[PDB]
Amino acid sequence: MSWVQLAGHTGSFKAAGTSGLILKRCSEPERYCLARLMADALRGCVPAFHGVVERDGESYLQLQDLLDGFDGPCVLDCKMGVRTYLEEELTKARERPKLRKDMYKKMLAVDPEAPTEEEHAQRAVTKPRYMQWREGISSSTTLGFRIEGIKKADGSCSTDFKTTRSREQVLRVFEEFVQGDEEVLRRYLNRLQQIRDTLEVSEFFRRHEVIGSSLLFVHDHCHRAGVWLIDFGKTTPLPDGQILDHRRPWEEGNREDGYLLGLDNLIGILASLAER
């Protein structure tokens, strides 16, 4: 499993010809973001982006293989933000819902009372409604991030974090993730602190709604730890000059992603975790 594969993406991910690279199905928001990020304070905080290549009539982001320097990577994909869908997707869901049966059924199996009577009748919900529900049953709403997935060095993968919500549950996931590796945790924390600092000055970050992106925590048994922001497929610029502080609550209209609330909390949780 490659890190794009681990961010739970396409089935398009592929090795490039060049060692230490990784092809991700190109998406325009992401290419744009990565390009900006390469010229941003956050350049170091995101996989190197080497541009786009064509293979098989499809465009791929040539990304640093974030896993490449790691020897048996443990990977945790942490979706950042109190909100995990664009406001534009919420708007589109109201205007023109694409009803998702699969997502309904996922809600219905998890919390049969969660779908409204109408959703029950449709056997389908909109993705944003699914995502909002996902945010509320996970830590996204309250903490501004959530664990999506873990790949362990043992090859195992889990995405079973959907109802990981409380600060402790999250802490526990991270605790299990880092497997007592204090160095990794410290590195993670240092990295996050640094990422936060970078975020807080990043021109890109202040100008973009960063939704659906993840912090990809990678470490290995050699205690290499990295964190990178990845998955900028839903990171989109704010209207000219408009900025987000990325902390204040999302209130439809303000495009606030709570990214930094998430990162604040994540840091807090990791910091709490480091002190256990």
Folded structure, characterized:
It is built from eleven helices and 13 strands. The protein has helices spanning 3-6, 28-37, 87-95, 101-110, 117-122, 127-137, 140-143, 167-178, 182-201, 203-206, 259-274; strands at residues 14-15, 21-25, 49-55, 58-64, 74-80, 99-100, 125-126, 145-151, 157-158, 208-211, 214-219, 225-230, 234-237. The strands form four sheets. A five-stranded antiparallel beta sheet has the order 9-8-5-11-12. Strands 1-2-4-3 form a four-stranded antiparallel beta sheet, covered by helices on one side. Strand 3 (49-55) and strand 4 form a beta hairpin. It is classed as transferase. The entry lists the keywords inositol phosphate kinase, transferase, calmodulin-binding.
Provide a quick synopsis of the model:
The protein has 276 residues and is of the alpha+beta class.
Domains (count): 1
User: What is the number of beta strands?
Assistant: 13
Helicity, as a percent range: 25-40%
What's the N-to-C terminus distance?
A: 31 Å
* Topology order in helix (H) and strand (E) letters: HEEHEEEHEHHEHHEEHHHEEEEH
- Named at the architecture level, the CATH assignment is 2-Layer Sandwich
Biggest sheet descriptor: 5 strands, antiparallel
According to CATH, the fold-level topology is D-amino Acid Aminotransferase, Chain A, domain 1
Can you identify the CATH class?
A: Alpha Beta
> CATH homologous superfamily - what is it?
Inositol polyphosphate kinase
The strand order across the widest sheet is 9-8-5-11-12
Oligomer state of the chains in this structure: monomer
* Percent range for β-strand residues: 15-25%
Structural class: alpha+beta
Gyration radius over CA: 18 Å
Binding site for substrate: 79, 100, 127-134, 234
EC number: 2.7.1.127
Modified residues (Phosphoserine): 12
Enzyme class: transferase
